[PDB]
Design a protein around this ligand. Structure first.
Ligand SMILES: NC(=O)c1ccc[n+]([C@@H]2O[C@H](COP(=O)([O-])OP(=O)(O)OC[C@H]3O[C@@H](n4cnc5c(N)ncnc54)[C@H](OP(=O)(O)O)[C@@H]3O)[C@@H](O)[C@H]2O)c1
Ligand SMILES: NC(=O)c1ccc[n+]([C@@H]2O[C@H](COP(=O)([O-])OP(=O)(O)OC[C@H]3O[C@@H](n4cnc5c(N)ncnc54)[C@H](OP(=O)(O)O)[C@@H]3O)[C@@H](O)[C@H]2O)c1
Ligand SMILES: C[C@]12CC[C@@H]3c4ccc(O)cc4CC[C@H]3[C@@H]1CC[C@@H]2O
Ligand SMILES: C[C@]12CC[C@@H]3c4ccc(O)cc4CC[C@H]3[C@@H]1CC[C@@H]2O
Lengths: 285, 285
């Protein structure tokens, strides 16, 4: 159908549920290109798509690895319509542990995927939206890009980076009639975390005993935050559709109002210490 | 002298003036290791140091390239005292132009220096401060890390990343008695900008005519913002000393109160659109 939507990172979580929520839409107005780093993992996407009854042709899958600009351009070339009306930059990776225990590859990967990957997506797809004078870009955001979290130093570094990247682009884009919005998400049940790490044996080798202990405490605490605040990817998908529907989309959309008070205490105390003291008390006690 | 201070990026600007402001301090309590990417450029540092009368031994220069962990560890090994009381992460690069005109090397460099470089500094020097139960880390910040600026997409991406990185570390660090603060700076007369770019011929080749035109407009506008708001590096150095003096340093220190209203409109309108509309009007008219 008429609105062409291209989504990154659709093998699971937000991306997967958003592709099927769009392709199974009552109005049948979306033509979805669900992109995945590795096409062989598309099984779960179709199982969900078939549970929602997506009309043949409403959903097509492509291989798109955000670390490779040749993969990104190849995917763009497979959009048969020759246009993308809604570009959703969703692919992302986590990175957890003491800063000193993180290796150079892991740090570099996180920045390459979460930041440079988005830049690649935007360089390949913004030109044509500017030429056409229209387009929507939706970026999966995180409360981790709005407030720092202990033992997520590089991950927060990467999520804050998208905030800077998208805000800077948004200031330029108004006059071109291209809208950019971030969908700010808290914890989401998606297996994002399941790969965020483990291996206490190796970690203890890379840091001191006190840091290690504080790490275990952070891990106990995020086990409760996840049970307390994870949302399901279906709920998050609805926030994207809210954004793609608005005639004049705002820069930010929040999927929960839950972390706002905490967010407000970084501003109402500009020195930023109130936040630091409050987050240390919530995490470590 | 007694407080050992190690500073990155001292061939010019903030780093240069901060090293000499500390080594020429009346109390003569600072022993400064002024680090530079390339030792052969140390001329300007000494000229200023000799204009301020720094006692022999108050200032030592080392080579330290933040993109190389071997250079970073080698520099740490030359601290004869075996300790660093104040670590100042100042090295940084700019990147300007239409997002689509930026090459992969340039983007990668900016992130490698501004973000990963700080991570390298922190991995090499935090362990010993945690072991000792004391230390101050001061990071040169930017209003560009707090609000997005058109045509500085990757630069803002990198400066926001430091915000995330330092806030996340700050939450962990309290209990270790190690303080981390960011020194938020606006435009500074330092030649940072002088290398931020030019070459309209090559740029026009990489983007569309409308974007190009908007770029020229941004360039006219930053010529006035720089004359209107640049501060001198001596003024910025005093803010670092304010931070290193406080018995309980806050996470953020601002060198000007000038951009706060703008900063406040990103929060008081959480959708973040008020800011986007206001920044577009200030830059493009
Ligand atoms: N999960 C949370 O609690 C949470 C909270 C806030 C924000 N977010 C954000 O939500 C987004 C979606 O993640 P999720 O929570 O749904 O986790 P997820 O279930 O692990 O899904 C992330 C997707 O990104 C893909 N991806 C990873 N590397 C890629 C690459 N190089 N090229 C293309 N795609 C790649 C993954 O594919 P593969 O499976 O093949 O690797 C997967 O399809 C991320 O940007 C993110 O960080 C998540
Ligand atoms: N200038 C502004 O208007 C402004 C505004 C806000 C924030 N800041 C920030 O202020 C900091 C200091 O910059 P500045 O304004 O003083 O500009 P600058 O005069 O160009 O000084 C930056 C210094 O960083 C060094 N550097 C660059 N790459 C390095 C590397 N790979 N390893 C070690 N050192 C390296 C440069 O050395 P080389 O000369 O050899 O390259 C130079 O000594 C930066 O983090 C920054 O982005 C500046
Ligand atoms: C930033 C994340 C969402 C917000 C989460 C949060 C939010 C508030 C809080 O007090 C603790 C945590 C712990 C884990 C955080 C997450 C780590 C991954 C995710 O992106
Ligand atoms: C972010 C910077 C400081 C703040 C500057 C600013 C701040 C406010 C504003 O309205 C325009 C500009 C243009 C250039 C910006 C700068 C680019 C380099 C510097 O780091």
């Amino acid at each position: 159908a008429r609105t062409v939507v291209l989504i990154t990172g659709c093998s699971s979580g937000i991306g997967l549920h958003l592709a099927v929520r769009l392709a199974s839409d009552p109005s049948q107005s979306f033509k979805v290109y669900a992109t995945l780093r590795d096409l062989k993992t598309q099984g779960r996407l179709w199982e969900a798509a078939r549970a929602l009854a997506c009309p043949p042709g409403s959903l097509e899958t492509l291989q798109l690895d955000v670390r490779d600009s040749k993969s990104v351009a190849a995917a763009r070339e497979r959009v048969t319509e020759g246009r993308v009306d809604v570009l959703v930059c969703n692919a992302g990776l986590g990175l957890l542990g003491p800063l000193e225990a993180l290796g150079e590859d892991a740090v570099a990967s996180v920045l390459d995927v979460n930041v440079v990957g988005t830049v690649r997506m935007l360089q390949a797809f913004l030109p044509d939206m500017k030429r056409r004078g229209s387009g929507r870009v939706l970026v999966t955001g995180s409360v981790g890009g709005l407030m720092g979290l202990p033992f997520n130093d590089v991950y927060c570094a990467s999520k804050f980076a998208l905030e800077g990247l998208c805000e800077s682009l948004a200031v330029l884009l108004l006059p071109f009639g291209v809208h950019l919005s971030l969908i700010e998400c808290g914890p989401v049940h998606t297996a994002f975390m399941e790969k965020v790490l483990g291996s206490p044996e190796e970690v203890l080798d890379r840091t001191d005993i006190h840091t290690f202990h504080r790490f275990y405490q952070y891990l106990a605490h995020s086990k409760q935050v996840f049970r307390e605040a994870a949302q399901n990817p279906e709920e998050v998908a609805e926030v994207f559709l809210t954004a793609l529907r608005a005639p004049k989309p705002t820069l930010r959309y929040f999927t929960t109002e839950r972390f706002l008070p905490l967010l407000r205490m970084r501003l109402d105390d500009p020195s930023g210490s109130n936040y630091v003291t409050a987050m240390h008390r919530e995490v470590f006690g």
